[model samples]
Target: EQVKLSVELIACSSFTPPADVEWSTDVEGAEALVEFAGRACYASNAAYLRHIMEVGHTALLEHANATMYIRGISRSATHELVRHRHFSFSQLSSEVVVPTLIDEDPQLRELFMHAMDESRFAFNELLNALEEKRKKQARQAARAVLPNATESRIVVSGNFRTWRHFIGMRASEHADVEIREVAVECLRKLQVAAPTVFGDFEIETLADGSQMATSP
Candidate 1:
C-alpha cells in the first residue's frame, strides 16, 4: 500500500564506429550515435538529427535503444502502457499504488485501505483452499480479486524513436493522471541522457501542479 512508482534506465545502446569506416574523426554520446546513423545514408550530416526528424526521417534513431525498469506502478497504468507495442514489455506483471487524492480524506483513505486489506485476505483464502500441489497455478484465479491499483513492474525497451513517441503521447494532458505522471518522469530522465534526442520536449507544470510534456 505504500509503494510508489520508480523508474530506472538499466541499459542503453552504445556503439563504436568500425576502424575502417570514415564516418567521422571521432564520436561520443547516444546523440552522436543517431547522428552517425543518419549521416551514413547521405555520406553526410552533426547537430542535424533534429533536422532529419523535421524532414520526416527518424529511422536513424532506431540504432540506439534504451531499456528501463518501471517498478511499483499500478497494473492500471501498465495496461495503458503496453498499448504502445513498440516498447517491448517483459515481466510486466507488486504492493499497491495509493492515490494522493485520498491523502487528506481520512475516511476515504480508510475506506480504500479497507478494500485493499480485504482483497488480500480473500485472495489468500482462495489460493490456500485449492489443491496443495496446485497452489502455484491456483494463484492465477486468486489474483482476480486484486485491484487494478495493485503494484506491477514492467521491464520495457525500445529504440529512441519510439521513446520520443511514447513520452510525447503519454506525457500529454490527454493521458490519464497516473500514466502522465510516470511518462513525464521518463521524459526528464531522457532529457538528461540525450538532450539532443529528447530536448524538444518541454515539461510544464499545470494548474493542478501535475506536469505535462510539450514538443515542437
Candidate 2:
C-alpha cells in the first residue's frame, strides 16, 4: 500500500482583516491588510532569534483567552483544517445538529442537492457495492468529491511559531484559493497589535520561493 501524506495550512480568525472595506485604504489602491512582517507584530519585535521564542510564549498566553468559531466552511475544508493540532474545536456535528435550510436561495439549494446526490449519494452506493476486500478503501475513496463550502467551527491557541508556519503555507500561492483568503485575512489582523515584529518580517518567500532563515 502506498502511504499518502498531505499537508494543509489554515488562518485563524484572530488574524483575519475587517470585512466590507474597499481594497485601497492602506497600500496604493491596495487593502490595508498587513504583510507577513505585520503578522510578527502580534509578538512585537524580537531583538534576535532568542527574542522570537519569547514572543511566541506571549502569544500562547493571549491565545488562551480566545475561543473562536467559524461557520460556513465545508466538510472537506474541515478535514484539511484539523491538521493544525494546536487548536481546540467544537463542530456542528451532522449526526447531532440538523443543517439549516434558511438563508439559502433556491438556486443554491438546488446546486447543493445536486452535488449531494452525485457526490454523497452516488459515492455511498459505490461504497456499498464493494465487497469485504474493498470496504477498507471505501472511506478514502469518498473524499474525492468533498466540496469546499462545508461549514465547521474550531478554536485555535498557538504561539507565534505555529502562526508563522500557518501564514507561510496558507498565504502562499501554493495553497488553495479559499484557504489562502483565510490566511491573508488573519495576517492582516495580527499585525495591528504586534506591528514591529510582523511589519519587519514580511513573507519575502511569497515573492520568491526562497529559504527562510532566522536572523539573530
Against the true structure, what is each candidate's TM-score? 0.90, 0.42
Regions of candidate 2 where Cα sits further than 4 Å from its true position: 1-67, 94-148, 201-216
lDDT score for candidate 2 against the true structure:
0.44
Candidate 1: 10-residue stretch with minimal lDDT: 41-50
Q: Write the per-residue lDDT of candidate 1 for residues 1-216, one digit (tens) a residue.
A: 658778998887776777897766334667778877776787233358668777868788888888888987888898888899888888743387877566457898789888898999998888888755456678888889999889888899999989988887889865478889889888788877777778778899887677899887
lDDT of 2 by residue, 110-161 (tens): 6655665565666577666654445567766754654444345544545555
lDDT of 2 at 207: 39
The pairs that clash in candidate 1 are none
**Model 2: lDDT of residue 104:** 35
Steric overlap count per candidate: 0, 19
Residue 142 of candidate 2: its Cα lDDT?
59
Q: Ten residues in a row with the worst lDDT in model 2?
A: 24-33
